[PDB]
Design an enzyme around this catalytic site. Structure first.
Site, PDB file in Angstrom:
ATOM      1  N   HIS A  60       0.835  -1.206   0.000  1.00  0.00           N
ATOM      2  CA  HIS A  60       0.000   0.000   0.000  1.00  0.00           C
ATOM      3  C   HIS A  60       0.882   1.276   0.000  1.00  0.00           C
ATOM      4  CE1 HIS A  60      -3.036   2.902   1.402  1.00  0.00           C
ATOM      5  NE2 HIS A  60      -2.235   3.223   2.411  1.00  0.00           N
ATOM      6  N   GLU A  86      -6.146   9.355   0.945  1.00  0.00           N
ATOM      7  CA  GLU A  86      -6.443   7.911   0.849  1.00  0.00           C
ATOM      8  C   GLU A  86      -7.499   7.541  -0.150  1.00  0.00           C
ATOM      9  OE1 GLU A  86      -5.356   4.863   2.313  1.00  0.00           O
ATOM     10  OE2 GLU A  86      -3.611   5.923   2.792  1.00  0.00           O
ATOM     11  N   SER A 141      -4.286   1.056  -4.235  1.00  0.00           N
ATOM     12  CA  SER A 141      -3.698  -0.218  -3.786  1.00  0.00           C
ATOM     13  C   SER A 141      -4.775  -1.244  -3.530  1.00  0.00           C
ATOM     14  CB  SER A 141      -2.808  -0.023  -2.530  1.00  0.00           C
ATOM     15  OG  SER A 141      -3.571   0.380  -1.436  1.00  0.00           O
ATOM     16  N   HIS A 200       0.910   5.342  -1.980  1.00  0.00           N
ATOM     17  CA  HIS A 200       1.317   6.678  -1.579  1.00  0.00           C
ATOM     18  C   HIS A 200       2.539   7.274  -2.306  1.00  0.00           C
ATOM     19  CE1 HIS A 200      -1.275   7.303   1.957  1.00  0.00           C
ATOM     20  NE2 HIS A 200      -1.057   6.052   2.336  1.00  0.00           N
TER      21      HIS A 200
HETATM   22  N1  LNR Z   1      -5.088   7.082  10.627  1.00  0.00           N
HETATM   23  C1  LNR Z   1      -5.666   5.705  10.518  1.00  0.00           C
HETATM   24  C2  LNR Z   1      -4.587   4.687   9.955  1.00  0.00           C
HETATM   25  O1  LNR Z   1      -5.129   3.357   9.870  1.00  0.00           O
HETATM   26  C3  LNR Z   1      -4.005   5.171   8.574  1.00  0.00           C
HETATM   27  C4  LNR Z   1      -3.418   6.496   8.499  1.00  0.00           C
HETATM   28  C5  LNR Z   1      -2.835   6.954   7.300  1.00  0.00           C
HETATM   29  C6  LNR Z   1      -2.814   6.111   6.151  1.00  0.00           C
HETATM   30  O2  LNR Z   1      -2.229   6.573   5.019  1.00  0.00           O
HETATM   31  C7  LNR Z   1      -3.387   4.785   6.173  1.00  0.00           C
HETATM   32  O3  LNR Z   1      -3.307   4.027   4.998  1.00  0.00           O
HETATM   33  C8  LNR Z   1      -3.988   4.308   7.388  1.00  0.00           C
HETATM   34 FE    FE Z   2      -2.220   4.979   3.619  1.00  0.00          FE
END
Ligand code: LNR
Ligand code: FE
Length: 308
Positions: free
Chosen positions: A169, A214, A233, A174
């Site tokens: 992921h 996200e 992802s 990202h």
């Molecule tokens: N903030 C909740 C946590 O599960 C999370 C934070 C940032 C992210 O990029 C993610 O994929 C998950």
């Molecule tokens: Fe994330």
């Protein structure tokens, strides 16, 4: 009284003693729960993150054949979608990641190499993260263009599923957007807005983060594509977000900031950003409404936050 926030990039080291100690891999529900080898491998990566300090190269890890196999499966299945479903900024940088960072089905890229590549593009850097940081600490790192990144991989029994972020992921979702200058400025504005903000506003900024970083969609001419890491992802949701099923709304922060979402099903609705420059301006305006008795500026020359 004003919650504490880091004022120099080195102070992010203080976060390691502030994570959730009992991780997702401990839940009976986790794909890797009955697997003691997986459990030990997760502790191993958690120790690497726990001991990491700003400024150090990130430790390289030799991934096992089973782990490279899981990566190859995810990489090959998702890659077929990017050309038609991902926003332009993603496809523009992906070939360069394949050539200089080793993004290929047979090899898991090492975070140090990816972090050096990001530094040359927009000055973003990565740091390994043990477990779950609070939203405050996680968003606060962004103010310094620092992304806390997981280094472990999901369990090999379910390659297309992870109940938590993992390295697939981070790298396929990202990393490509952090190579873009406008997205980098936009993510940093979210981070700067969070510094010393009251807890109830951190939750609003975490929701904005969820619906942009996200699960955000971009307007690209008369078309719509995906830029959210969670969509890029997720094989199933990436195809679904560009179909007729979900409801699409223009990104409007006073509205997005309080919208509810679930983390277990495909999102019923997504917000469409006009461009990352525009989203950045919207965040900057929203930040002016946050009650803080001061103003903040990052000084990239000294890597310090200036409190006005
Ligand atoms: N903030 C909740 C946590 O599960 C999370 C934070 C940032 C992210 O990029 C993610 O994929 C998950
Ligand atoms: Fe994330």
């Amino acid at each position: 009284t004003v919650p504490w926030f880091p004022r120099t990039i080195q102070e992010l080291d203080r976060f390691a003693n502030q994570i959730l100690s009992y991780g997702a891999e401990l839940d009976a529900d986790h794909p890797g729960f009955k697997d003691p080898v997986y459990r030990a491998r997760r502790k191993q990566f958690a120790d690497i993150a726990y001991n990491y300090r700003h400024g150090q190269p990130i430790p390289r890890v030799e991934y096992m054949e089973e782990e490279k196999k899981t990566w190859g499966t995810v990489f090959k299945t998702l890659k077929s979608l990017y050309k038609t479903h991902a926003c332009y900024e993603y496809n523009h940088i992906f070939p360069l990641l394949e050539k200089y960072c080793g993004f290929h089905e047979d090899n898991i890229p090492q975070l140090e190499d990816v972090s050096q590549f990001l530094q040359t593009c927009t000055g973003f850097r990565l740091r390994p993260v043990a477990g779950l940081l609070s939203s405050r600490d996680f968003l606060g790192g962004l103010a310094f263009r620092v992304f806390h990144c997981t280094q472990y991989i999901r369990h090999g029994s379910k390659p297309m599923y992870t109940p938590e972020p993992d390295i697939c992921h981070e790298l396929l979702g990202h990393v490509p957007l952090f190579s873009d200058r406008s997205f980098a400025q936009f993510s940093q504005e979210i981070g700067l807005a969070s510094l010393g903000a009251p807890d109830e506003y951190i939750e609003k900024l975490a929701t904005i983060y969820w619906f942009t970083v996200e699960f955000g969609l971009c307007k690209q001419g008369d078309s719509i594509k995906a830029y959210g890491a969670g969509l890029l992802s997720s094989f199933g949701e990436l195809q679904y977000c560009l179909s007729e099923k979900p409801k699409l709304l223009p990104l409007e922060l006073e509205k997005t900031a309080i919208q509810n979402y679930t983390v277990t099903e495909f999102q019923p609705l997504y917000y469409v950003a006009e461009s990352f420059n525009d989203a950045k301006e919207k965040v900057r305006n929203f930040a002016a409404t946050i009650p803080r008795p001061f103003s903040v500026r990052y000084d990239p020359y000294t890597q310090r936050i200036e409190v006005l």
